[PDB]
Design a protein around this motif. Structure first.
Motif, mmCIF file in Angstrom:
data_model
loop_
_atom_site.group_PDB
_atom_site.id
_atom_site.type_symbol
_atom_site.label_atom_id
_atom_site.label_comp_id
_atom_site.label_asym_id
_atom_site.label_seq_id
_atom_site.Cartn_x
_atom_site.Cartn_y
_atom_site.Cartn_z
ATOM 1 N N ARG A 188 7.057 -0.501 -0.578
ATOM 2 C CA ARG A 188 7.513 -0.989 -1.866
ATOM 3 C C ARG A 188 9.022 -0.835 -1.990
ATOM 4 N NH1 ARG A 188 2.999 0.513 -6.462
ATOM 5 N NH2 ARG A 188 1.187 -0.345 -5.340
ATOM 6 N N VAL A 189 9.542 0.308 -1.564
ATOM 7 C CA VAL A 189 10.983 0.531 -1.629
ATOM 8 C C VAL A 189 11.719 -0.470 -0.752
ATOM 9 C CG1 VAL A 189 12.864 2.069 -0.979
ATOM 10 C CG2 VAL A 189 10.889 2.963 -2.241
ATOM 11 N N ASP A 190 11.255 -0.631 0.487
ATOM 12 C CA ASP A 190 11.933 -1.518 1.430
ATOM 13 C C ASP A 190 11.902 -2.975 0.991
ATOM 14 O OD1 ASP A 190 12.700 0.571 2.954
ATOM 15 O OD2 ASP A 190 11.278 0.241 4.601
ATOM 16 N N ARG A 191 10.798 -3.401 0.391
ATOM 17 C CA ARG A 191 10.710 -4.766 -0.118
ATOM 18 C C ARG A 191 11.644 -4.945 -1.320
ATOM 19 N NH1 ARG A 191 11.248 -9.856 0.375
ATOM 20 N NH2 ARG A 191 9.866 -11.192 -0.868
ATOM 21 N N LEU A 192 11.641 -3.976 -2.232
ATOM 22 C CA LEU A 192 12.577 -4.009 -3.358
ATOM 23 C C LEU A 192 14.042 -4.021 -2.871
ATOM 24 C CD1 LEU A 192 12.871 -4.221 -6.353
ATOM 25 C CD2 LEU A 192 12.814 -1.706 -6.483
ATOM 26 N N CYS A 193 14.317 -3.346 -1.755
ATOM 27 C CA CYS A 193 15.660 -3.388 -1.161
ATOM 28 C C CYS A 193 16.043 -4.808 -0.778
ATOM 29 C CB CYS A 193 15.751 -2.498 0.071
ATOM 30 S SG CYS A 193 15.738 -0.735 -0.268
ATOM 31 N N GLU A 194 15.095 -5.532 -0.189
ATOM 32 C CA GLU A 194 15.308 -6.937 0.141
ATOM 33 C C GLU A 194 15.498 -7.784 -1.108
ATOM 34 O OE1 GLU A 194 11.791 -7.734 2.294
ATOM 35 O OE2 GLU A 194 12.486 -6.834 4.163
ATOM 36 N N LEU A 195 14.582 -7.634 -2.060
ATOM 37 C CA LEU A 195 14.655 -8.382 -3.307
ATOM 38 C C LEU A 195 15.997 -8.149 -4.005
ATOM 39 C CD1 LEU A 195 11.036 -7.827 -4.721
ATOM 40 C CD2 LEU A 195 11.987 -9.893 -3.662
ATOM 41 N N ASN A 196 16.500 -6.921 -3.913
ATOM 42 C CA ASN A 196 17.758 -6.590 -4.571
ATOM 43 C C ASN A 196 18.909 -7.344 -3.923
ATOM 44 O OD1 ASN A 196 19.506 -5.142 -6.430
ATOM 45 N ND2 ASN A 196 20.089 -3.822 -4.695
ATOM 46 N N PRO A 209 0.777 -1.246 0.000
ATOM 47 C CA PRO A 209 0.000 0.000 0.000
ATOM 48 C C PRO A 209 0.813 1.304 0.000
ATOM 49 C CG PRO A 209 0.001 -0.960 2.180
ATOM 50 C CD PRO A 209 0.676 -1.959 1.285
ATOM 51 N N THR A 210 2.010 1.321 0.579
ATOM 52 C CA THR A 210 2.774 2.569 0.637
ATOM 53 C C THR A 210 4.059 2.507 -0.189
ATOM 54 O OG1 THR A 210 4.112 2.017 2.595
ATOM 55 C CG2 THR A 210 1.909 2.935 2.996
ATOM 56 N N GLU A 211 4.537 3.671 -0.625
ATOM 57 C CA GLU A 211 5.779 3.753 -1.384
ATOM 58 C C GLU A 211 6.955 3.254 -0.552
ATOM 59 O OE1 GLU A 211 9.391 6.214 -2.974
ATOM 60 O OE2 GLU A 211 8.571 5.799 -0.986
ATOM 61 N N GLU A 212 6.958 3.570 0.740
ATOM 62 C CA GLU A 212 8.053 3.143 1.605
ATOM 63 C C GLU A 212 8.123 1.624 1.733
ATOM 64 O OE1 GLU A 212 7.928 4.533 5.613
ATOM 65 O OE2 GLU A 212 9.982 3.882 6.052
#
Ligand SMILES: [Zn+2]
Length: 209
Positions: A141-149, A136-139
């Motif tokens: 999404r960013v934090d999950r993408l940080c993990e995925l990265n 739901p939030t941009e933060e």
């Protein structure tokens, strides 16, 4: 004003010398770090401090968003020197939450040269667009993408012929993925450690030389 840094340095070196006058002399004779840190350039993520290490302990590479590419001789040369020459036992791939490089990859502003650097993270956001959309939030999404990265970069490191050849010749070497919280100082294991050829997909395994 640079003077503060120079003065800081003199004070730090002299202080160390009074507790152990041979500290630097001993250290300078050989390089024997057990770890390679691959992390982000973000000023808030200094490797030695975060894991309580001293000079001599951590071979370090840092770039924007801790990206590892198989055509990048900059990062690959650090890995190869660490693995083949220094014979580090562990590679610590450490990303962090709130990473601006990752965040940029989710937005559509052109930042210039770095746009190309962050391509593989943009690819990841596309690959996982369904997953990220449900956040739901941009933060978030960013934090999950940080993990995925971080998880992707652990794969990228483990797939290098540098690492696989270390394994082919019986060298002990593990690749770990961790993520640092700039909000709380905590360095967390993502539990994606790779330590051998058998953990690699067949499509990525190389035969010995
Ligand atoms: Zn970052």
């Amino acid at each position: 004003d640079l003077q503060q840094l120079f003065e800081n340095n003199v004070r730090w070196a002299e202080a160390i010398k009074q507790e152990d006058p041979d500290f630097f002399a001993k250290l300078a004779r050989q390089q024997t770090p057990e770890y390679l840190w691959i992390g982000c350039s973000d000023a808030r993520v200094p490797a030695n401090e975060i894991v309580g290490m001293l000079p001599g302990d951590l071979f370090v590479h840092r770039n924007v968003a801790n990206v590892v590419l198989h055509t990048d001789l900059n990062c690959l040369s650090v890995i190869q020197f660490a693995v083949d020459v220094l014979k580090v036992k562990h590679i610590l791939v450490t990303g962090h939450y709130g990473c601006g490089g990752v965040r940029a990859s989710l937005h559509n502003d052109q930042l210039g040269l770095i746009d190309g650097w962050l391509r593989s993270i943009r690819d990841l956001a596309y690959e996982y667009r369904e997953h990220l959309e449900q956040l739901p939030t941009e933060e978030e999404r960013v934090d999950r993408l940080c993990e995925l990265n971080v998880i992707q970069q652990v794969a990228n490191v483990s797939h290098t012929s540098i690492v696989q050849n270390a394994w082919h010749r019986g060298q002990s070497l593990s690749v770990h993925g961790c993520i640092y919280g700039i909000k709380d100082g905590l360095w967390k294991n993502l539990n994606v450690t790779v330590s051998g050829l058998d953990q690699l997909p067949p499509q990525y395994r190389l035969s010995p030389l």
